[PDB]
Short mmCIF file of C-alpha atoms in Angstrom, two decimals:
data_model
loop_
_atom_site.label_atom_id
_atom_site.label_comp_id
_atom_site.label_asym_id
_atom_site.label_seq_id
_atom_site.Cartn_x
_atom_site.Cartn_y
_atom_site.Cartn_z
CA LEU A 1310 26.73 -16.39 -1.27
CA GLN A 1311 26.96 -12.70 -2.14
CA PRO A 1312 25.14 -10.93 -5.00
CA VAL A 1313 27.84 -10.45 -7.63
CA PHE A 1314 25.92 -7.44 -8.93
CA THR A 1315 22.90 -5.36 -7.91
CA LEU A 1316 20.86 -2.60 -9.53
CA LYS A 1317 17.53 -0.81 -9.17
CA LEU A 1318 15.21 -0.41 -12.16
CA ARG A 1319 12.44 2.14 -11.71
CA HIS A 1320 9.86 0.07 -13.62
CA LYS A 1321 7.46 -2.46 -12.15
CA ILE A 1322 8.24 -5.83 -13.72
CA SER A 1323 5.32 -8.08 -14.56
CA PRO A 1324 5.93 -11.37 -12.73
CA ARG A 1325 6.14 -14.15 -15.31
CA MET A 1326 7.38 -11.90 -18.15
CA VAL A 1327 11.20 -11.80 -17.96
CA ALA A 1328 13.90 -12.94 -20.36
CA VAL A 1329 17.64 -12.60 -20.96
CA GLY A 1330 18.79 -12.38 -24.56
CA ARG A 1331 21.89 -11.32 -26.47
CA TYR A 1332 19.97 -8.83 -28.59
CA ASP A 1333 23.20 -7.35 -29.96
CA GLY A 1334 24.32 -10.85 -30.96
CA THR A 1335 27.08 -10.99 -28.33
CA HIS A 1336 25.81 -8.51 -25.70
CA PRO A 1337 23.26 -10.01 -23.30
CA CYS A 1338 20.42 -7.77 -22.14
CA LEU A 1339 17.24 -8.03 -20.07
CA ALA A 1340 13.72 -7.83 -21.49
CA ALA A 1341 10.85 -7.42 -19.06
CA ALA A 1342 7.22 -6.36 -19.28
CA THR A 1343 5.91 -3.33 -17.40
CA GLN A 1344 2.69 -1.49 -16.62
CA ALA A 1345 0.83 0.28 -19.46
CA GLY A 1346 1.83 -2.47 -21.90
CA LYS A 1347 5.46 -1.47 -22.45
CA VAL A 1348 8.45 -3.81 -22.55
CA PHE A 1349 11.74 -2.45 -21.25
CA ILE A 1350 15.25 -3.51 -22.22
CA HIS A 1351 18.22 -3.13 -19.87
CA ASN A 1352 21.42 -3.22 -21.93
CA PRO A 1353 24.25 -4.06 -19.51
CA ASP A 1354 20.33 2.36 -19.78
CA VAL A 1355 16.70 1.24 -20.03
CA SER A 1356 15.00 1.46 -23.43
CA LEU A 1357 11.22 1.26 -23.76
CA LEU A 1358 9.25 -0.58 -26.45
CA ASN A 1359 5.62 0.46 -26.90
CA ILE A 1360 3.65 -2.74 -27.21
CA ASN A 1361 0.68 -0.45 -26.42
CA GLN A 1362 -1.14 -3.58 -25.32
CA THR A 1363 -1.29 -5.71 -22.17
CA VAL A 1364 1.51 -8.27 -22.48
CA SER A 1365 0.94 -11.83 -21.28
CA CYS A 1366 4.08 -13.72 -22.36
CA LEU A 1367 7.71 -12.87 -23.02
CA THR A 1368 10.79 -14.91 -23.89
CA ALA A 1369 13.95 -14.66 -25.98
CA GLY A 1370 15.88 -17.20 -28.00
CA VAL A 1371 17.38 -18.18 -31.33
CA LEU A 1372 14.61 -18.36 -33.93
CA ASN A 1373 16.75 -18.50 -37.09
CA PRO A 1374 20.11 -20.22 -36.42
CA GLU A 1375 21.62 -18.62 -39.54
CA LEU A 1376 22.46 -15.55 -37.44
CA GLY A 1377 23.62 -15.37 -33.84
CA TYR A 1378 21.06 -12.95 -32.41
CA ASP A 1379 18.38 -13.56 -29.81
CA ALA A 1380 14.83 -12.74 -30.92
CA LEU A 1381 12.65 -10.97 -28.35
CA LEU A 1382 9.21 -12.58 -28.32
CA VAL A 1383 6.16 -10.77 -26.93
CA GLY A 1384 2.80 -12.49 -26.59
CA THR A 1385 -0.57 -10.85 -26.07
CA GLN A 1386 -4.02 -12.34 -25.55
CA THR A 1387 -4.65 -11.71 -29.25
CA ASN A 1388 -1.20 -11.25 -30.87
CA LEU A 1389 2.35 -12.59 -31.01
CA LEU A 1390 5.40 -10.60 -32.07
CA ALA A 1391 9.00 -11.56 -32.73
CA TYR A 1392 11.39 -8.63 -32.61
CA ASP A 1393 15.01 -8.19 -33.70
CA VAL A 1394 15.91 -5.40 -31.29
CA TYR A 1395 19.31 -4.76 -32.88
CA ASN A 1396 17.97 -3.99 -36.37
CA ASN A 1397 14.47 -3.09 -35.27
CA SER A 1398 12.40 -5.20 -37.65
CA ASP A 1399 9.54 -7.60 -37.05
CA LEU A 1400 10.54 -11.20 -37.68
CA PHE A 1401 6.84 -12.04 -37.67
CA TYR A 1402 3.75 -10.33 -36.23
CA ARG A 1403 1.13 -13.07 -36.15
CA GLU A 1404 -2.44 -12.67 -34.90
CA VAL A 1405 -3.45 -15.73 -32.90
CA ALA A 1406 -7.06 -15.05 -31.82
CA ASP A 1407 -6.58 -17.91 -29.36
CA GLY A 1408 -4.36 -15.93 -26.98
CA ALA A 1409 -0.84 -16.10 -25.61
CA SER A 1410 -0.98 -17.48 -22.07
CA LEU B 478 0.36 61.64 -11.90
CA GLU B 479 -1.10 59.81 -8.91
CA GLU B 480 -4.74 59.06 -9.70
CA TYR B 481 -3.37 58.21 -13.16
CA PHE B 482 -0.97 55.55 -11.87
CA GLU B 483 -3.70 53.56 -10.13
CA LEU B 484 -5.48 52.92 -13.43
CA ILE B 485 -2.18 51.75 -14.92
CA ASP B 486 -1.69 49.40 -11.98
CA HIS B 487 -5.23 48.02 -12.31
CA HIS B 488 -4.59 47.39 -16.01
CA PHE B 489 -1.32 45.62 -15.26
CA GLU B 490 -2.84 43.51 -12.49
CA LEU B 491 -5.47 42.35 -14.97
CA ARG B 492 -2.72 41.57 -17.49
CA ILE B 493 -0.75 39.50 -14.97
CA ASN B 494 -3.91 37.67 -13.92
CA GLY B 495 -4.58 36.86 -17.57
CA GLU B 496 -1.08 35.48 -18.08
CA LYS B 497 -1.49 33.29 -14.98
CA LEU B 498 -4.87 32.03 -16.16
CA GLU B 499 -3.39 31.18 -19.56
CA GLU B 500 -0.38 29.31 -18.16
CA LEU B 501 -2.84 27.33 -16.02
CA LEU B 502 -5.04 26.57 -19.03
CA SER B 503 -1.91 25.24 -20.74
CA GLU B 504 -1.40 22.63 -18.02
CA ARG B 505 -5.07 21.68 -18.00
CA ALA B 506 -5.00 21.19 -21.78
CA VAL B 507 -1.86 19.06 -21.54
CA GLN B 508 -3.54 16.85 -18.93
CA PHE B 509 -6.63 16.50 -21.11
CA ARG B 510 -4.50 15.55 -24.12
CA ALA B 511 -2.56 12.93 -22.15
CA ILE B 512 -5.69 11.28 -20.76
CA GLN B 513 -7.26 11.42 -24.22
CA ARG B 514 -4.27 9.64 -25.75
CA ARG B 515 -4.49 6.98 -23.05
CA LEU B 516 -8.17 6.47 -23.83
CA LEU B 517 -7.47 6.30 -27.57
CA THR B 518 -4.86 3.62 -26.90
CA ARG B 519 -7.43 1.68 -24.87
CA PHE B 520 -9.86 2.08 -27.78
CA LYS B 521 -7.55 0.84 -30.55
CA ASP B 522 -6.74 -2.24 -28.47
CA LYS B 523 -8.80 -5.35 -29.17
CA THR B 524 -8.78 -6.93 -25.72
CA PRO B 525 -11.33 -5.71 -23.15
CA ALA B 526 -10.07 -3.99 -20.04
CA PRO B 527 -11.34 -1.91 -17.11
CA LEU B 528 -11.36 1.80 -17.84
CA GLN B 529 -9.74 2.25 -14.39
CA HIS B 530 -11.79 5.44 -13.99
CA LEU B 531 -9.83 7.12 -16.78
CA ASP B 532 -13.14 8.54 -17.99
CA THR B 533 -13.63 10.15 -14.57
CA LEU B 534 -10.22 11.84 -14.76
CA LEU B 535 -11.13 12.98 -18.27
CA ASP B 536 -14.41 14.48 -17.04
CA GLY B 537 -12.65 16.25 -14.18
CA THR B 538 -10.01 17.68 -16.51
CA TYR B 539 -12.71 18.78 -18.96
CA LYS B 540 -14.54 20.62 -16.18
CA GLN B 541 -11.28 22.31 -15.18
CA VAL B 542 -10.62 23.35 -18.79
CA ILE B 543 -14.10 24.82 -19.23
CA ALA B 544 -13.83 26.72 -15.94
CA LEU B 545 -10.45 28.13 -16.95
CA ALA B 546 -11.74 29.10 -20.40
CA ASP B 547 -14.64 31.03 -18.87
CA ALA B 548 -12.21 32.68 -16.45
CA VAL B 549 -9.96 33.76 -19.32
CA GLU B 550 -12.95 35.17 -21.21
CA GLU B 551 -14.07 37.24 -18.23
CA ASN B 552 -10.51 38.43 -17.66
CA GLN B 553 -10.29 39.50 -21.31
CA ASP B 554 -13.48 41.54 -20.93
CA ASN B 555 -12.25 43.16 -17.71
CA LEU B 556 -8.91 43.93 -19.37
CA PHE B 557 -10.69 45.59 -22.28
CA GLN B 558 -12.77 47.77 -19.96
CA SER B 559 -9.64 48.73 -18.02
CA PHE B 560 -7.85 49.57 -21.27
CA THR B 561 -10.64 51.89 -22.42
CA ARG B 562 -10.72 53.66 -19.05
CA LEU B 563 -6.92 53.97 -19.16
CA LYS B 564 -7.16 55.48 -22.65
CA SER B 565 -9.52 58.14 -21.32
CA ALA B 566 -7.22 58.82 -18.36
CA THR B 567 -4.11 59.20 -20.51
CA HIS B 568 -6.05 61.46 -22.88
CA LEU B 569 -6.78 63.71 -19.92
CA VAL B 570 -3.17 63.53 -18.74
CA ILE B 571 -1.76 64.56 -22.13
CA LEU B 572 -4.29 67.40 -22.17
CA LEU B 573 -3.20 68.60 -18.73
CA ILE B 574 0.47 68.37 -19.71
CA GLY B 575 -0.11 70.32 -22.92
CA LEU B 576 -1.85 72.99 -20.87
CA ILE C 139 -23.88 -0.56 28.71
CA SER C 140 -26.35 -2.35 26.44
CA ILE C 141 -24.02 -5.35 26.17
CA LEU C 142 -23.46 -5.27 29.93
CA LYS C 143 -27.21 -5.18 30.58
CA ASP C 144 -27.87 -8.14 28.29
CA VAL C 145 -25.01 -10.32 29.52
CA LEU C 146 -25.65 -9.61 33.21
CA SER C 147 -29.34 -10.39 32.76
CA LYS C 148 -28.28 -13.65 31.11
CA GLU C 149 -26.01 -14.49 34.05
CA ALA C 150 -28.82 -13.67 36.48
CA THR C 151 -31.28 -15.91 34.63
CA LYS C 152 -28.61 -18.61 34.75
CA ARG C 153 -28.02 -18.34 38.50
CA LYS C 154 -31.60 -17.52 39.62
CA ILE C 155 -31.06 -14.00 40.95
CA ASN C 156 -33.83 -11.77 39.50
CA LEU C 157 -31.80 -8.59 39.84
CA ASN C 158 -33.06 -5.04 39.28
CA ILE C 159 -31.69 -2.80 36.51
CA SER C 160 -32.00 0.98 36.33
CA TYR C 161 -30.33 2.79 33.45
CA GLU C 162 -29.91 6.43 32.39
CA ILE C 163 -28.82 8.29 29.27
CA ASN C 164 -27.02 11.55 28.62
CA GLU C 165 -28.81 12.92 25.56
CA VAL C 166 -25.48 14.11 24.11
CA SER C 167 -23.47 10.88 24.43
CA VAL C 168 -24.55 9.68 20.98
CA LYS C 169 -23.26 12.98 19.57
CA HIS C 170 -19.91 12.39 21.28
CA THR C 171 -19.59 8.83 19.97
CA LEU C 172 -20.50 9.94 16.44
CA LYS C 173 -17.91 12.73 16.60
CA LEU C 174 -15.42 10.08 17.71
CA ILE C 175 -16.32 7.80 14.80
CA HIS C 176 -16.39 10.49 12.09
CA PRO C 177 -12.59 10.76 11.53
CA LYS C 178 -12.25 7.00 11.03
CA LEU C 179 -14.99 6.80 8.40
CA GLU C 180 -13.62 9.92 6.72
CA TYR C 181 -10.18 8.31 6.54
CA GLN C 182 -11.58 5.05 5.15
CA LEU C 183 -13.56 6.86 2.45
CA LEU C 184 -10.56 8.99 1.46
CA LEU C 185 -8.51 5.78 1.35
CA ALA C 186 -10.98 4.25 -1.11
CA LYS C 187 -11.22 7.42 -3.21
CA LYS C 188 -7.44 7.68 -3.60
CA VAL C 189 -6.80 4.00 -4.29
CA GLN C 190 -9.48 4.12 -6.99
CA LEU C 191 -7.30 6.51 -9.01
CA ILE C 192 -3.83 5.27 -7.96
CA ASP C 193 -3.44 2.85 -10.87
CA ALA C 194 -5.02 5.15 -13.45
CA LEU C 195 -2.52 7.84 -12.47
CA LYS C 196 0.31 5.30 -12.52
CA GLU C 197 -0.54 4.53 -16.15
CA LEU C 198 0.05 8.21 -16.91
CA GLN C 199 3.21 8.29 -14.79
CA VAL C 200 5.15 5.88 -17.02
CA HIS C 201 5.06 8.39 -19.91
CA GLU C 202 6.60 11.87 -20.31
CA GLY C 203 8.38 11.59 -16.94
CA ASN C 204 5.88 13.82 -15.09
CA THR C 205 7.66 17.14 -15.54
CA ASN C 206 4.91 19.71 -16.13
CA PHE C 207 1.41 18.24 -16.47
CA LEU C 208 0.18 16.23 -13.47
CA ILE C 209 -2.05 18.21 -11.11
CA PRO C 210 -0.48 18.75 -7.66
CA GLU C 211 -3.58 17.12 -6.13
CA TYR C 212 -2.89 13.72 -7.69
CA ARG C 213 0.84 14.40 -7.40
CA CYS C 214 0.31 14.10 -3.64
CA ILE C 215 -0.98 10.58 -4.33
CA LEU C 216 1.73 9.51 -6.80
CA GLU C 217 4.31 9.40 -4.00
CA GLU C 218 2.29 7.74 -1.22
CA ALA C 219 0.64 5.31 -3.67
CA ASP C 220 2.45 2.43 -1.95
CA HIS C 221 1.15 3.14 1.56
CA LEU C 222 -2.32 3.89 0.18
CA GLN C 223 -2.39 0.57 -1.68
CA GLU C 224 -1.14 -1.44 1.30
CA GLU C 225 -3.73 0.15 3.60
CA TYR C 226 -6.51 -0.48 1.09
CA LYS C 227 -5.91 -4.20 1.64
CA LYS C 228 -7.01 -3.86 5.27
CA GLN C 229 -9.62 -1.12 4.68
CA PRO C 230 -12.72 -3.31 3.98
CA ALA C 231 -12.52 -5.05 7.37
CA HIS C 232 -12.35 -1.68 9.13
CA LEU C 233 -15.25 -0.34 7.06
CA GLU C 234 -17.43 -3.36 7.83
CA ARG C 235 -16.54 -3.13 11.52
CA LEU C 236 -17.42 0.57 11.59
CA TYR C 237 -20.75 -0.05 9.86
CA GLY C 238 -21.58 -2.81 12.33
CA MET C 239 -20.62 -0.64 15.30
CA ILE C 240 -22.75 2.25 14.02
CA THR C 241 -25.78 0.03 13.42
CA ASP C 242 -25.43 -1.52 16.88
CA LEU C 243 -25.14 1.95 18.42
CA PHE C 244 -28.30 3.07 16.60
CA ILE C 245 -30.29 -0.06 17.46
CA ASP C 246 -29.27 0.04 21.13
CA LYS C 247 -29.84 3.77 21.66
CA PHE C 248 -33.33 3.24 20.29
CA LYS C 249 -33.74 0.06 22.34
CA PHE C 250 -33.19 1.83 25.66
CA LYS C 251 -36.29 3.98 25.11
CA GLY C 252 -38.29 0.76 24.72
CA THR C 253 -38.53 0.66 20.92
CA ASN C 254 -37.65 -1.96 18.30
CA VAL C 255 -36.03 -0.39 15.24
CA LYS C 256 -34.47 -3.49 13.70
CA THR C 257 -36.27 -2.54 10.46
CA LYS C 258 -34.78 0.90 9.67
CA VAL C 259 -31.31 -0.63 9.17
CA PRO C 260 -31.21 -0.56 5.32
CA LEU C 261 -31.89 3.18 5.25
CA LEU C 262 -28.95 3.61 7.62
CA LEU C 263 -26.82 1.45 5.34
CA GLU C 264 -27.71 3.66 2.37
CA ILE C 265 -26.99 6.79 4.42
CA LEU C 266 -23.55 5.41 5.26
CA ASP C 267 -22.95 4.64 1.59
CA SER C 268 -23.60 8.37 1.21
CA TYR C 269 -22.27 9.38 4.67
CA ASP C 270 -23.55 12.90 5.15
CA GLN C 271 -22.45 13.26 8.77
CA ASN C 272 -25.03 15.96 9.45
CA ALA C 273 -27.72 13.93 7.70
CA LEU C 274 -26.41 10.98 9.72
CA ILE C 275 -26.92 12.73 13.06
CA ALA C 276 -30.29 13.96 11.78
CA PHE C 277 -31.37 10.40 11.02
CA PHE C 278 -30.08 9.42 14.47
CA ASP C 279 -32.13 12.01 16.34
CA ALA C 280 -35.27 11.79 14.19
CA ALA C 281 -35.71 8.08 13.39
#
């Protein structure tokens, strides 16, 4: 086939930490880990989120079906964070102590 | 008006050297602050991790900052000596103009 | 020439020849070979020294966009980080090969005079961990 779209993002993406989520409710965006423990969000501009900690997991889905927004999840070897990027507010910041592999 | 201008030029060369030393000290201090914030972030974090020789960069930057601080001190002393000598020279020049 | 001497003596002993060897040494050849080697070891050590700090500097790169603070010295590494990192993957083989070649050169150039210096190797290994080229040639000429 042919790549229907292409783009170059200046940030190194951590391999197994990538997700696509409609963080605006109806506007899908890309969430991907990076060096220094920061998670970037590509909207269609790149916006950084300071996890300030080495990420080890990352996904995005519907965690409360009452609303139609995707929740950005970020796992760390000692923490786990759900994030409503639209209205920046922690859905839950749990401390696992078992890790997020 | 000609052996008087050389003292002025020495004074101004010392002033320019001081401004350069200070604008270099600014960059060294910014580097030190950035590496220090990185290290503080590594400290607050629970999980262990290699320092990645960040401490070595911090030591190098600290040595640079101390060297630049000593250089600025010596330049301040030289500038003060040059200013006193220039004060004497301009005293003499005003005397010779008033005569 | 040491390898040639050994292998030809082996062939002679195989085929019952009992040949006659007569060697000779230019007392400056070792200096020439060491001057040849020096750039390669210098490049390998600089490779290691830069790739040690590549990632630490990259951690600083991701913040504040690198407008005013990074020293020009490490700024020369921030661009060529990729080539430095991809050559560091092959570096250790070259370093081990160079160390082996230097130790064989040392052992052989002492073997021609009739000596057996298979014991002074660890001091040479430590010297190469330091790699003072002038101290290296001094250790070559002295012991």
